[PDB]
Amino acid sequence: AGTSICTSEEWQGLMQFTLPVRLCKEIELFHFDIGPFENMWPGIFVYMVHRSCGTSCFELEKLCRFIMSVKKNYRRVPYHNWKHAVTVAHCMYAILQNNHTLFTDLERKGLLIACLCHDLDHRGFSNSYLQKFDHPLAALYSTSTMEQHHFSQTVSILQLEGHNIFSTLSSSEYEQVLEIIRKAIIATDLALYFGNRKQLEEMYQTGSLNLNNQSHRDRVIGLMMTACDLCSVTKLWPVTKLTANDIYAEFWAEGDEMKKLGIQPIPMMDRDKKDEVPQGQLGFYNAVAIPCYTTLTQILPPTEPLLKACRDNLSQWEKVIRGEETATWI
Numbered sequence: 001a002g003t004s005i006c007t008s009e010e011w012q013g014l015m016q017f018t019l020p021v022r023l024c025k026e027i028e029l030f031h032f033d034i035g036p037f038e039n040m041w042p043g044i045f046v047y048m049v050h051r052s053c054g055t056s057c058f059e060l061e062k063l064c065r066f067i068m069s070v071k072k073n074y075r076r077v078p079y080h081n082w083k084h085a086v087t088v089a090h091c092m093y094a095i096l097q098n099n100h101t102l103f104t105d106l107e108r109k110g111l112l113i114a115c116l117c118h119d120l121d122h123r124g125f126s127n128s129y130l131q132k133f134d135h136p137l138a139a140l141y142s143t144s145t146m147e148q149h150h151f152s153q154t155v156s157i158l159q160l161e162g163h164n165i166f167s168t169l170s171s172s173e174y175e176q177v178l179e180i181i182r183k184a185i186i187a188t189d190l191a192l193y194f195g196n197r198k199q200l201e202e203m204y205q206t207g208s209l210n211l212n213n214q215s216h217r218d219r220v221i222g223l224m225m226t227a228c229d230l231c232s233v234t235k236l237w238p239v240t241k242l243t244a245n246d247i248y249a250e251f252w253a254e255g256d257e258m259k260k261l262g263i264q265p266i267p268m269m270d271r272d273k274k275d276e277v278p279q280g281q282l283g284f285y286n287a288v289a290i291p292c293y294t295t296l297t298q299i300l301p302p303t304e305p306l307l308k309a310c311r312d313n314l315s316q317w318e319k320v321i322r323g324e325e326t327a328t329w330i
């Protein structure tokens, strides 16, 4: 229902922001956790943009207008919110800085912006819900429903008064960056990931993989988006554990909505089935997470610490199943 605009007071404050000395060396790491730095979140992203894309890549006035309005268009939901957006943006950064010369100036700016916009206006409902209960979004966007909406939300923010960070690019480059973003955002639909990963794995093993081949690039970028989107599983265990509480909180509230509409949900969305969570996580790690981080490491060897951390977190979920958990506090 429309689009929000940040207050003059909000974007003006962000211009003044300086990232504390200590964090500059910490932010660079794959395992870094934005969580203890809430007030600094918008300023963290600006920082990341300036290191990777240069301080004059975007008109700072417009950049600050963009970021704060992006913040205001995320919803007070338990998982697919502002915190998630900034977390994903940071994982992309770490990948980029670690693989810098493989990606053009145009792809770097667009990917960082795409990560921050990738869950715009998320309601805390899955694609499954919308398509089952024939929500208008499902009739408009028959596939990749929320994703198409996220991208459409991003373009709506760009189209705001003084919000268009991209204007300074040529008409040819403008076209390209909206397409980089669109593909990046659509690639966060996990339905697509399975095919994409299988395709990349096979390309890598047979050694036909070629980053000068556009279609191949699109795919590697796609897996990068998947890797960032799921980076909750690559942090240290305490952080990985707390984030799951948020992921499930939102799942169960959707399962709670389905019970009212007279349909019993999948175990994962059932707050009376919390006992299946550790086994569910094992399966999600073996089915999705591990393979995603394995293929990405093969293609981009500096991204390895993500795989190691994910293997560690999977070992922790295995510990949980054998009954070796620790307090967690919540």
Ligand SMILES: O=[N+]([O-])c1cccc2cccnc12
Pocket: 230, 232, 233, 247, 268, 280, 281, 284
């Ligand atoms: O629980 N899941 O199956 C599950 C579904 C979708 C995204 C996830 C991200 C991190 C951990 N688990 C996830």
Ligand code: NI
Pocket: 118, 119, 146, 188, 189
């Ligand atoms: Ni999403």
Ligand code: NI
Pocket: 084, 088, 118, 119, 188, 229
């Ligand atoms: Ni996401």
